[model samples]
Target chain A: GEGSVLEQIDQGSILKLPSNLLFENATSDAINQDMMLYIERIAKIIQKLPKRVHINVRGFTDDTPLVKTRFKSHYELAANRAYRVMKVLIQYGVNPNQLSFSSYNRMKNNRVEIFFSTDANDLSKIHSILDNEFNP
Target chain B: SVLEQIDQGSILKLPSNLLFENATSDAINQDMMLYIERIAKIIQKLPKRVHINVRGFTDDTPLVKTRFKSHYELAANRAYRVMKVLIQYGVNPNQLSFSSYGSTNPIAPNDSLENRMKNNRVEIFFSTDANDLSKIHSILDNEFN
Candidate 1:
């Protein structure tokens, strides 16, 4: 289990955890011990915040096309991974209301980006940071 | 005049210099003022039966580290800002609806800076009840000419 990677984007901070750490392969949704460790680390920070902040888990995948299956599309598979992380976070005591998730079909690389902000201003700052870091 | 432009399916570009910074900023500049004035005038000439739909978009530039929650939020804010100006100019609030497509539907390829800038804009579309399509056919025919 690799430790979470933190980087300053624009004027905000973001935590990036590659999907390879969470799933055995692109299609699997199983949570590995490394991912559980990462979640516990995030939960620890969340518990210490002075005020309740919003947590966003963004799921991303490669551009590989999906075959006919239970999942409607590649994006849905990514969404499931994000939701799985959210569920585990909740199990670790993170407030479900403070958590949200979104899925993207393609990215520079496959990963789940975890972002948290105290207010809307912070949220925008984080978004700007993520946009540059992810795209570049 | 603005309504005529929209009626012909021509998208009116907001002044790029108006508020190029952050998506949440609401400060309207002189260029934006002129843009809003034209839209207000067009609203007066529109048929009462017609509705206005506003769609917002952004360039292919990834909006990673910004104040917006997501690209969708940024795009929506652009549309909402335009809608707010229209409403303040006396257009009926009931006549308007808006949505944001982020960079999903770009008008130009994102290969260059100029092209990317061109992709960021708001579009106005007119719609009516399907039952009224025949009644509006003549209006559409004339506008196309």
Candidate 2:
């Protein structure tokens, strides 16, 4: 309750699906195509938010180094996948700056998943970090 | 084939390295000697202030194989072999952290012969403040000169 502005800025909570939904196939072609479809479906739900929202896309996978897409080294794979999803949301007319990206690389204690969250308003500064085209 | 399977990180074949075949007291003791001796040399070569991490690998599930074996003891045996060897050579056990990922962490999948071989093993990590480039340069200099 006594949390400071910085704490509030980081106070965002994650909204995760009750259970992970496997893509049936995680190959580049399958993931690229199916994830686009999935994100589009999610964007439809978020379109109803009245004000601009700040969303963080954090991807997760089981603890293993295999599974090329889900590999431990694929933190970027997750980030890029999320970015592509956000891009589709943009095309769906969601504001490009309204969506943000971050990845936690097998650190979420879950299997095959992604989570999104919105910070009420105190998260604008993080946009600078996300918008860097070549940041990774 | 057993050793090969171990390399592949096959969860099922883990217990396949039966005590009768691979973990027998004599077989383990023999391998233990070589394993420890090799690690002792590594400890001797490291620069002061660097820490080494040693780990054991074991399947998370507890089930006896047809040969009737336990992976926990097998994994501990392997880790202990290395640590004991390092200590005998004067390496500080206190400086090392012994950790285990159980079966939850597999570098390779259990589905194949080749992959499991790559997964079965202990890792020795040497930590240094030097950056990647500097570390490579030092290795290059040492190799050439």
Candidate 3:
């Protein structure tokens, strides 16, 4: 976060999905087919929300050394995970314009955070935050 | 495959010959100290929330002229020894624990010395207590319909 990335979100509901439930391996971004049904259900929930809802899917990873993946770093792995989730949401009819994804790292756990709100400001400020954090 | 996979995490199994003075002994050998150090360094880089459990297993061998009372003590000491070595290298003690299976669970029956050596080994398990998905699912259930 540049200065404060999360503060940009004045108010929103954050839903964190553990990586184990979504990916088969700790280092992988591949979404297992077993969890695809659940992702579809989550998309339905997003479908019922107001069209104004803007959702940012943020991904995370543990601070361990990676072994089984082609990912260069946790940032790359997280980006893939977030993008995959966003892609699935759009596949299930959620408008792509209402969606964005970010990568996070060095957590005690691997996960993806789905932050949503009606305030465009909640999603707008993330671009600057990402620029500051990952630009280097 | 990480040798094997658990639903919640993964497993890395190391044979006793890899770390001990001998298959029947629990002492950490000098030759393998570097190996343990490497593993510890990797664990050091991991998140503090990542918990590691060092599990020790032994073959069905009866007591001899040892201070230990039973196979349980032998196995416990083996797991404890490895766990201590891991901490010595830099792994956080807060995220570590050890378990002993004694002679209850063996990879092979105690038929021959070679097979018994296979059973007497340590396993380092990787898992985490962090799971926010269950709550996410609950919220999805109530709010979605």
> Top DockQ: which candidate number?
3
User: Model 2, which residues run further than 4 Å from truth?
Assistant: A1-136, B1-31, B59-62, B66-77, B128-145
True contacts kept of each: 0.00, 0.00, 0.02
Model 1, B31-142: lDDT tens per residue? 6766675667776565675567777777656555666766678778888878888888888888888888877887678686555655666666555543222322232223
* Per-model DockQ: 0.01, 0.01, 0.04
Off by over 4 Å in 1: A1-136, B1-27, B132-145
DockQ of 1: 0.01
Residue-level error in angstroms, candidate 1, position A98:
63
Q: Is candidate 1 or candidate 3 better by TM-score?
A: 3
**What would the per-residue lDDT of candidate 3 be over residues B47-118, giving only the tens digit for each residue?**
566678898887776677556777788888989999999998888899999999888888877787767677
lDDT (10s digit) by residue, model 3, range A1-136: 0111121232465666777778887878788777677667667877876676778888988878785668888789889999998888888877888889999844436777788765433122322222332223
What is the per-residue lDDT of model 2 for residues A32-83, given as tens digits with 9 covering 90 to 100?
Answer: 4534555565565456443434555554444455456543365654554445
TM-score of each: 0.41, 0.33, 0.49
Say which candidate scores most in lDDT.
Answer: 3
DockQ pick, better of 2 and 3: 3
